[PDB]
Design a protein around this ligand. Structure first.
Ligand SMILES: Nc1ncnc2c1ncn2[C@@H]1O[C@H](COP(=O)(O)OP(=O)(O)OP(=O)(O)O)[C@@H](O)[C@H]1O
Ligand SMILES: Nc1ncnc2c1ncn2[C@@H]1O[C@H](COP(=O)(O)OP(=O)(O)O)[C@@H](O)[C@H]1O
Ligand SMILES: [Mg+2]
Ligand SMILES: [Mg+2]
Lengths: 238, 294, 50, 41
């Protein structure tokens, strides 16, 4: 219907016969909107992202896709780079479409990086190629995720290796402009709470379960402690 | 013997071609064998080095300019600073401003073609590399974990007791996580730490540095993969636990170094501002104020 | 002869690699360094003495 | 050089002993076959 992904009572385990790393997972991700998963270290965010994708073994519950999942544009927390060039990593088995490629390059601000390296936009990347900075690896992975014409985008901490300006420009030109104009489902795991005003939907996680799931106006009344805790972290969250 | 010519001429030619391929393998190993090595000898005498040559943690940096190779652009240009012992130095700047090469300069991982880094009256270029890199601790932004136990990752040489390892884990907010594991300190970390999260891997590397208990800590964007709530309590417990130790903290988030003693603002490899944050935020046109406000 | 060369070449390679600078490790791919321990050392230990 | 690393790692004594022992063994086998040819006549 109006949702992209939905989980009802999902118990998922990394181990085959161990303790469930996720318990009582109940999410309703809207389609064409920005959903932000927020929480502490090791609280189930990447586990939720891979439990929707089927990469983690399910013990209980149901997973519904109303997109039969289909493709999902995924940028892992550890950036994965093929042994091909910059252009082949960003395109990633897709037609070229240079007008979109320039927009993705400017949204990730990778244009100064391809004005360096011995063969800009053609240098071999990863193993058997030139070594990149970790921020450059992160932005090439995010550029691959943003470039594709996939209805669902999964981003898992894209601002970990970047400074304030790169993360702000990638948030505005890439997430709020390039992804919104396509009416694209965006699920964005982040530790940067300053982007919470730009979120349509918020999923809060705590020790491998869904603590609270709703908008910022919902968190203003349902979870007063977590709302005020967020306000203390980033110094009325409208 | 003619029948042996008919049987063995082919075998001789085949073994000659095989031996050429085997000698190609030996040739590749010898080509990797002639690679240059770092100078671990050091010009200063080992008797001139004290038992704790970072006795208090004073750092002088005099006209330092570093690069990564010959005929390459210097990533730091005329860096000159003083760090009193026990002072906390927060380093901020945009990505690409040479502030990780600044951290690598103390371990001689970059080509210091000019300038000196004098620590407690001793130039570090005169020292052996194991002597220099054994008495200083660094926390890289990207975590590196090895296969084995938690005890092996924190203490591979087995030079510290279990109480030191538990203090290192408790400072790095991993007391409850490691205690929840059934092995405890013997819980197995997989290859690359794939059984833990990115934040938990980075906290394991932080606890790995907390075992060493040196006089100079260099935290090069350590808390980048960590959420803000646990980053604040980790920063507070690091400040309280290392109150007498010189900490050079490279800030992924600028608001973490608002309580630092001095703030080094790097612009394109040059120290634009090096002063207290209280005076630095008083100036409206200062770049550090633009970092805090935006 | 095979045992002596197989011991000495691996000892020399392992000692010379760990002293090489990090510029060498960043410039050279890790597959090129690792295949000397994996394939070339396997030839020297086993295939060459036969 | 790089192709001669195996000979230098083996040493002069071990390599020369290998070559001399193989040559002596094969010339002994030639002598056995020649003495068998003389014996059968
Ligand atoms: N591949 C894995 N195999 C086994 N256990 C895992 C794996 N990944 C995570 N875990 C465990 O499951 C829990 C959830 O980790 P998860 O991957 O969801 O972290 P995260 O919330 O994305 O972390 P962070 O925000 O610190 O990067 C943790 O306790 C972790 O140890
Ligand atoms: N391993 C390396 N080899 C050569 N140059 C490097 C290396 N690492 C970084 N650089 C250079 O240093 C500059 C960035 O400095 P760095 O300390 O990485 O800044 P930051 O700390 O802001 O990431 C880049 O312009 C890059 O060219
Ligand atoms: Mg994750
Ligand atoms: Mg850096």
């Amino acid at each position: 219907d109006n949702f992209c992904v939905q989980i009802i009572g999902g118990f998922f385990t990394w181990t085959p016969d161990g303790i469930p790393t996720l318990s009582n997972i109940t999410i309703r991700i809207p389609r064409g909107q920005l959903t932000m998963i927020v929480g502490q270290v090791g609280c189930g965010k990447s586990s939720l992202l891979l439990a929707t994708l089927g990469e983690m073994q399910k013990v209980s519950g149901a997973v519904f896709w109303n997109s039969s999942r289909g493709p999902v544009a995924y940028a892992s927390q550890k950036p994965w780079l093929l042994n091909a060039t910059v252009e082949e990593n960003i395109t990633f088995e897709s037609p070229f479409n240079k007008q979109r490629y320039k927009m993705v390059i400017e949204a990730c601000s990778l244009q100064p990086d391809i004005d360096i390296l011995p063969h800009g936009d053609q240098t071999q990347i990863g193993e058997r190629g030139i070594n990149l900075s970790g921020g450059q690896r992160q932005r090439i992975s995010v550029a691959r995720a943003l470039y594709q014409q996939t209805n669902v985008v999964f981003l898992d901490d894209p601002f970990s290796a970047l400074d304030v300006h790169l993360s702000d420009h990638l948030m505005q030109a890439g997430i709020l402009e390039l992804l919104r104009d396509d009416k694209r489902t965006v699920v964005l795991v982040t530790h940067k709470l300053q982007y919470l005003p730009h979120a349509d939907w918020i999923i809060a996680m705590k020790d491998g379960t869904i603590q609270r799931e709703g908008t910022l106006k919902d968190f203003q009344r349902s979870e007063c402690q977590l709302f005020e805790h967020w306000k203390t972290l980033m110094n009325e969250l409208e | 013997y003619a029948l042996m010519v008919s049987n063995y001429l082919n075998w001789m030619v085949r073994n000659l071609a095989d031996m050429e391929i085997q000698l190609g393998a030996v040739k590749r190993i010898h080509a990797l064998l002639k690679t240059e090595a770092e100078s671990y000898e050091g010009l200063l005498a080992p008797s001139l080095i004290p038992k704790n040559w970072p006795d208090q943690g004073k750092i002088q940096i005099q006209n330092l300019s570093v690069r990564y190779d010959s005929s390459l652009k210097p990533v730091l240009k005329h860096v000159n600073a003083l760090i009193s012992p026990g002072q906390k130095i927060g380093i901020c700047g945009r990505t690409g401003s040479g502030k990780s090469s600044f951290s690598l300069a103390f371990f001689r991982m970059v080509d210091m073609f000019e300038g000196r880094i004098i620590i407690d009256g001793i130039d570090i270029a005169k020292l052996p590399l194991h002597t220099l890199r054994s008495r200083l601790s660094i926390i890289l932004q990207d975590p590196v974990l090895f296969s084995g136990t938690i005890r092996f990752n924190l203490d591979p040489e087995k030079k510290c007791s279990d109480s030191t390892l538990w203090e290192a884990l408790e400072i790095a907010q991993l007391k409850l996580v490691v205690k929840a594991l059934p092995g405890g300190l013997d819980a197995i970390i997989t290859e690359g730490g794939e059984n833990f999260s990115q934040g938990q891997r980075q906290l394991f590397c932080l606890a790995r540095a907390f075992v060493r208990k040196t006089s100079i800590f260099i935290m090069d964007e350590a808390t980048a993969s960590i959420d803000m709530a646990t980053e604040n309590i980790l920063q507070k417990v690091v400040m309280t636990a290392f109150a007498d130790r010189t900490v050079v903290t490279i800030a992924h988030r600028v608001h973490t170094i608002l309580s630092a003693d001095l703030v080094m603002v790097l612009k394109r490899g040059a120290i634009l501002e090096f002063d207290k944050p209280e005076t630095l935020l008083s100036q409206k046109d200062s770049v550090f104020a633009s970092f805090v406000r935006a | 002869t095979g045992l002596k060369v197989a011991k000495r070449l691996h000892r020399s390679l392992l000692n010379r690699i760990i002293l090489a600078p990090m510029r060498f490790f960043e410039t050279t791919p890790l597959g090129s360094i690792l295949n000397r321990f994996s394939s070339d050392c396997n030839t020297i230990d086993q295939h060459i003495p036969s | 050089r790089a192709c001669t690393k195996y000979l230098s790692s083996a040493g002069i004594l071990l390599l020369s002993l290998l070559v001399f022992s193989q040559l002596l063994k094969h010339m002994v086998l030639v002598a056995i076959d020649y003495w068998l040819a003389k014996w059968t006549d």
